[PDB]
Design a protein around this ligand. Structure first.
Ligand SMILES: *[C@@H]1O[C@H](CO)[C@@H](O[C@@H]2O[C@H](CO)[C@@H](O)[C@H](O)[C@H]2NC(C)=O)[C@H](O)[C@H]1NC(C)=O
Ligand SMILES: *[C@@H]1O[C@H](CO)[C@@H](O[C@@H]2O[C@H](CO)[C@@H](O)[C@H](O)[C@H]2NC(C)=O)[C@H](O)[C@H]1NC(C)=O
Ligand SMILES: *[C@@H]1O[C@H](CO)[C@@H](O)[C@H](O)[C@H]1NC(C)=O
Ligand SMILES: *[C@@H]1O[C@H](CO)[C@@H](O)[C@H](O)[C@H]1NC(C)=O
Ligand SMILES: *[C@@H]1O[C@H](CO)[C@@H](O)[C@H](O)[C@H]1NC(C)=O
Ligand SMILES: *[C@@H]1O[C@H](CO)[C@@H](O)[C@H](O)[C@H]1NC(C)=O
Ligand SMILES: *[C@@H]1O[C@H](CO)[C@@H](O)[C@H](O)[C@H]1NC(C)=O
Lengths: 71, 227, 215, 49
């Protein structure tokens, strides 16, 4: 169908509600294949969580993973 | 030691396999190779143009026209070709400056992350940096950053200081933790609880001007050998 | 203050040079693949702007959330924490204090990250650092009370950690007074964002003289 | 290219002073650095050292 963005108008792509990390940028936070169709969605900013903060709670690791990453 | 060595070898095997399977994992070098080749290709392709002349190749225009009349067309073809070449040279100068910045960053990273152990966070790998390995590339370098990523955290009840005998006790290194019934000193980055002694804590002042005091008995190692 | 990006201006070649003219374009094609090169250069710097903003702000793995209770040992962070009314107040002073076209070929493209999305990155970045410290930048986020985090930050500069704990309210008052003076100086004193205004003024100057070369 | 150099400096400063505590003197503020808070700006970033 036809979707209007702040970047412009994006035809041929259906607009969905849920958000993922995004592959092809368009602009104004809208990125775009999934399930035999071009979708368009606002960017997921990342996974969301809240840490269990209080004034006397500390969290200390017990184990550790050594990891090797390129650059 | 054995678990650390096994994690190291498994991480090296995983990074070999991940670089092996995934295509275009070397996009940072392939991009600079592709843009240099594209600039060179369009520099070659700017010889097909006429720039307003009647022919593109210089020998066929030189072989059919008198030099009083060939002079103007050779001059306009010279201006077009020279200004195209100057555009190419300016593009390559800016690209070489960008690659100089990248190579200075790589030299700094080799000096401070292979020859040493960097305390600049997120400069060599996500995590606390241990060591790294340089590896050659076609027109670059790849570093194998070995980092320490903690895992499996546990909640604990903490207090800033322990008031024993009217004095406030602070830890030398690490924090005061409590699993609910007892109170321990652990190092901050790994849960290794010891019993609070006077050899791993230090005193300063009374225990009433500091917010967050809990009471506990600080053990003295000097005591039980007297009896 | 540091600048991280420009405005993404993409031009057209035939629209700028000729513009609804077949004869001018037919003479322009004799000059070769010139404006393909010009469009490619401007497209390259326009995607470099998004690369810049992503490498500056998008450093968090996950978006962190402020706790509803704000009892950080006496420290008052409500002057930099984001507000549910609109952003943080200091970001509102910055957005007001900076004094930022599309005519023929000259277009602006929007950035990839919206200003609210960059605000959500900065909210996550400064809500992780008041509830975890740096441990959300190495592994998973591990909670710690904020006087304890400030105690080890004192311990990292050579001062023993008691010195915070007997002087906690004095440090809290000094912190709050300093943040209030930042808000007052940004509200009253102008021309402090000159570094962040020179980039916009230089881009406007270059686009304006590119327009005036048409006459 | 100048903006890219300043953005690389801003990314280095954000990763080294917000995500941690910096020890290199006069990198994040005059004095001994404790912590920093980033604030968004219309075309940039500002840090509070
Ligand atoms: C720390 O994590 C490591 C992760 O490898 C654990 O090691 C593995 O533990 C599982 C538990 O079922 C075993 O099946 C594997 O054989 C172990 N692998 C190795 C290489 O040791 C380790 O047990 C964890 N340690 C603690 C104290 O939790
Ligand atoms: C907190 O940790 C301590 C240290 O292990 C626990 O104390 C021991 O618990 C075992 C199991 O009941 C007993 O057999 C020991 O005699 C205890 N040691 C002492 C010195 O009393 C304690 O139970 C833990 N508390 C909680 C709530 O898990
Ligand atoms: C998205 O959600 C709104 C309300 O939550 C709904 O009206 C709309 O139909 C949804 N979009 C699609 C494509 O289903
Ligand atoms: C710490 O406790 C809180 C509340 O009891 C809980 O939500 C949180 O998951 C706990 N943290 C961990 C790491 O289990
Ligand atoms: C922590 O918070 C609780 C409730 O918010 C309060 O009762 C207590 O005095 C605080 N301070 C501590 C435990 O040092
Ligand atoms: C700690 O001990 C002192 C001295 O007996 C007492 O006055 C105070 O109430 C105690 N505090 C707690 C939390 O038990
Ligand atoms: C923080 O300061 C503001 C004004 O500076 C004030 O309105 C607010 O009540 C303070 N926060 C707390 C928790 O006292």
């Amino acid at each position: 169908n036809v979707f209007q963005t702040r970047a412009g108008c994006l035809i041929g792509a259906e607009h969905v509600n849920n958000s993922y990390e995004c592959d092809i940028p368009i602009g104004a936070g809208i990125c775009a294949v999934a399930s035999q169709s071009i979708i368009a969605y606002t960017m997921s900013l990342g996974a969301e969580n809240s840490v269990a903060y209080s004034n006397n709670s500390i969290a200390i690791p017990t184990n550790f993973t050594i990891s090797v990453t390129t650059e | 030691q054995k678990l650390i060595a096994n994690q190291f070898n498994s991480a090296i095997g995983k990074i070999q396999d991940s670089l092996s399977s995934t295509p275009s994992a070397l996009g940072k070098l392939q991009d600079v190779v592709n843009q240099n080749a594209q600039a060179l290709n369009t520099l070659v392709k700017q010889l097909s143009s006429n720039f307003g002349a009647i022919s593109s190749v210089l020998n066929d225009i030189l072989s059919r026209l008198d030099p009083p009349e060939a002079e103007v067309q050779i001059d306009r073809l010279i201006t077009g070709r020279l200004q195209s070449l100057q555009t190419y040279v300016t593009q390559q100068l800016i690209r070489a400056a960008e690659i100089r910045a990248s190579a200075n960053l790589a030299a700094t990273k080799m000096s401070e992350c292979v020859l040493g152990q960097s305390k600049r966070v997120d400069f060599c790998g996500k995590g606390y940096h241990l060591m790294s390995f340089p590896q050659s590339a076609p027109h670059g370098v790849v570093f194998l950053h070995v980092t320490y990523v903690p895992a499996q955290e546990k909640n604990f009840t903490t207090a800033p200081a322990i008031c024993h005998d009217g004095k406030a006790h602070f830890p030398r290194e690490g924090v005061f933790v409590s699993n609910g019934t007892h109170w321990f000193v652990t190092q901050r980055n790994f849960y290794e609880p010891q019993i609070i002694t006077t050899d791993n804590t230090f005193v300063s002042g009374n225990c009433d001007v500091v917010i967050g005091i809990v009471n506990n008995t600080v053990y003295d190692p000097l005591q039980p050998e007297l009896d | 203050i540091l600048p991280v990006s420009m405005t993404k201006t993409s031009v057209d070649c035939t629209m700028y040079i000729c513009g609804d003219s077949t004869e001018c374009s037919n003479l322009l094609l004799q000059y070769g693949s010139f404006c393909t090169q010009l469009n490619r250069a401007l497209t390259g710097i326009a995607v470099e702007q998004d690369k810049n903003t992503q490498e500056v702000f998008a450093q968090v793995k996950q978006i962190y959330k402020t706790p509803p209770i704000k009892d950080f040992g006496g420290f008052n962070f409500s002057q930099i924490l984001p507000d549910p009314s609109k952003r943080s107040p200091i970001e509102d002073l910055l957005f007001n204090k900076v004094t930022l076209q599309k005519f023929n070929g000259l277009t602006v493209l929007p950035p990839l990250l919206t200003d609210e999305m960059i605000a959500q990155y900065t909210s996550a970045l400064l809500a992780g650092t008041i509830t975890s410290g740096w441990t959300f930048g190495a592994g998973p986020a591990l909670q710690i009370p904020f006087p304890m985090q400030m105690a080890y930050r004192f311990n990292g500069i050579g001062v023993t950690q008691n010195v915070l704990y007997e002087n906690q309210k004095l440090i809290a008052n000094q912190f709050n007074s300093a943040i209030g003076k930042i808000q007052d100086s940004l509200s009253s004193t102008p021309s402090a964002l000159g570094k962040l205004q020179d980039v916009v003024n230089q881009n406007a100057q270059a686009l304006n003289t590119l327009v005036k070369q048409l006459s």
